[PDB]
Design a protein around this ligand. Structure first.
Ligand SMILES: [Zn+2]
Ligand SMILES: [Zn+2]
Length: 562
């Protein structure tokens, strides 16, 4: 640990818990530096009532401790890549940042931009704390950019709103100005809705070359070298902005301080203060953009190895750099356009199948696939390629026009809709309406979801505005968060604004909108034809009437089932 960089944050924590602070010599940390400890102190009813057949489906109910996740997934370490691998990583990262910044200029994001963003802070004492920490950063110090780690048995790293603002201020431009958008990056998909991703995969399937590869703990494999290469963006910044960004990179990214809970004696709990120089601090403002960046660099490197630009001699030391520069200048852009990269999620269409066994740089970089030396298996059919937890299928409207829709196992969709965050009928009903409308826009092709969504919408007052979050994904554009008629919204998304729908004829009725074939719907978890589901569908109007009774029969409801 670099005590000159992390000491101030450790001292601040100790000062807030001076009387309970202690050093636990029997702490369980092996690859994280340990500094000390101190003493430390649901179901959406509306959706559950309307999804009785899924009460007995573990795939659904299972979706509804921290130390275990830490020891197994976060408390690990791997060797440094060799010198040549590190030179290649730096050269490709420098080239990529220059390409991304050719038609964009870095900028400081404003206090006002952050305020308008949170309405999806009003106290001036918060901004006084924010200004104070900023002043420490400009002097070369950090007092409060500390993570609170929350394990889900993956690891979620939380930081106070002030630290997130300082990060947004210095690096938010990457998101706000769409540096990782497809137009700017070739391989990125930032800003695209789930409704567009299938068309990207289909376009890639037509590029001549090998099979489509979609090889998947990414955040734990980000090295200190990846972090340094990500930091090369500061070279494109003007002095003032650069000072703010270098401080975020130093304290939030490269010299992290984390608070983690641990069980103690006789039902009590302790908080541990630990530190780590590498790995990604999951859930930060630009985590997604930086993961996309580094994943693009990794895929370009894998393509250079596959194409025999990089030889086995180059892992140890890269003697000549000209071959790499010539490949990047000649082919870099063509290779980026053969990718779809969304953070840690990637699909690649290489020029041939040598990519499958191009594993020497990949493994030396510590970017191990989810056997280490077994060649990757590519996909011949783009409709089966996994991307962002979905696969994408071509269906046809009643009039014959094709559409490409997103799909995933239905248990995941229903399981997520049954989760309600925080301990009222108003809030649960408005959140159920958000899920139902999301399903009408994107998963209309699933029989059980079209019916369940219509039952939910028929059970919630028509004038109640959808609220809450139905997804964390950047590909969730929230078009369903509205009281506008969902057939109108469906037409806007799938016909009007869909650049892959040549004929702009509107669709006038839901019956013209297809379902998957029965075989595919069943493969992806449909309970169609299963007796408890048949009973649920036959009884659905009575179930809707029961929910209307609970919410209030005085409210105005619409029958979306009729
Ligand atoms: Zn700080
Ligand atoms: Zn499917």
């Amino acid at each position: 640990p670099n005590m000159k960089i992390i000491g101030n944050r450790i001292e601040r924590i100790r000062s807030e818990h001076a009387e309970t602070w202690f050093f636990d010599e029997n702490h369980p940390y092996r690859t994280w530096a340990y500094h000390g400890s101190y003493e430390a102190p649901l179901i959406n009813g509306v959706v559950r009532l309307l999804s009785k057949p899924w009460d007995v489906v573990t795939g659904v109910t299972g979706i509804a401790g921290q130390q275990r996740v830490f020891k197994e997934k976060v408390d690990t370490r791997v060797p440094d890549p060799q010198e040549g691998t590190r030179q290649v990583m730096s050269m490709v990262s420098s080239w990529l940042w220059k390409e991304l910044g050719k038609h964009k200029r870095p900028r400081v994001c404003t206090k006002e931009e952050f305020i308008n963003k949170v309405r999806s802070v009003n106290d001036p004492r918060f901004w006084a704390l924010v200004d104070k920490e900023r002043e420490h950063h400009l002097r070369g110090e950090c007092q409060s950019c500390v993570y609170n780690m929350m394990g889900k048995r993956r690891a979620i790293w939380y930081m106070w709103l002030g630290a997130r603002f300082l990060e947004f201020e210095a690096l938010g431009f990457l998101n706000e100005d769409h540096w990782m958008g497809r137009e700017n990056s070739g391989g990125g998909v930032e800003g695209l809705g789930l409704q567009r991703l299938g068309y990207v995969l289909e376009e890639m399937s037509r590029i001549p070359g090998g099979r489509m590869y979609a090889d998947d703990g990414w955040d734990t494999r980000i090295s200190r070298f990846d972090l340094e290469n990500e930091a090369l963006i500061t070279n494109q910044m003007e002095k003032g902005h650069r000072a703010l960004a270098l401080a975020i990179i130093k304290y939030t990214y490269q010299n992290k301080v984390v608070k983690v809970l641990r069980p103690a004696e006789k039902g009590k709990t302790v908080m541990d203060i630990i530190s780590r120089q590498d790995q990604r601090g999951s859930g930060q403002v630009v985590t997604y953009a930086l993961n996309t960046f580094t994943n693009l660099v990794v895929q370009l490197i894998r393509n250079m190895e596959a194409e025999e630009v990089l030889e086995m001699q180059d892992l140890w030391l890269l003697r000549r750099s000209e071959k790499v520069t010539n490949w990047l200048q000649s082919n870099g852009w063509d290779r980026l356009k053969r990718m779809a990269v969304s953070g840690d999620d990637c699909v690649v269409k290489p020029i041939d199948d040598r990519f499958a066994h191009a594993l020497r740089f990949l493994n030396d970089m510590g970017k191990v696939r989810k056997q280490e030396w077994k060649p990757s298996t590519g996909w011949d059919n783009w409709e089966e390629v996994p991307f962002c937890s979905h696969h994408f299928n071509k269906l046809h409207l009643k009039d014959g026009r094709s559409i490409v829709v997103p799909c995933r196992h239905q248990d995941e969709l229903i399981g997520r809709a049954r989760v309600s965050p925080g301990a009222s009928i108003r809030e649960t009903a408005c959140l159920a309406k958000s899920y139902a409308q999301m399903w009408q826009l994107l998963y209309f092709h699933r029989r059980d979801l079209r019916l369940m969504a219509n039952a939910i919408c028929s059970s919630v007052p028509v004038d109640w505005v959808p609220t809450g979050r139905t997804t964390w994904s950047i590909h969730g554009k929230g078009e369903w968060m509205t009281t506008e008629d969902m057939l109108v919204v469906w037409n806007r998304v799938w016909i009007e604004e869909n650049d892959h729908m040549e004929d702009k004829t509107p669709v006038t009725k839901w019956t013209d909108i297809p379902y998957l074939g029965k075989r595919e719907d069943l493969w992806c978890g449909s309970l169609i034809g299963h007796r408890p589901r048949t009973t649920w569908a036959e009884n659905i109007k009575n179930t809707v009437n029961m929910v209307r009774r609970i919410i209030g029969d005085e409210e105005k409801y619409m029958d979306y089932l009729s």
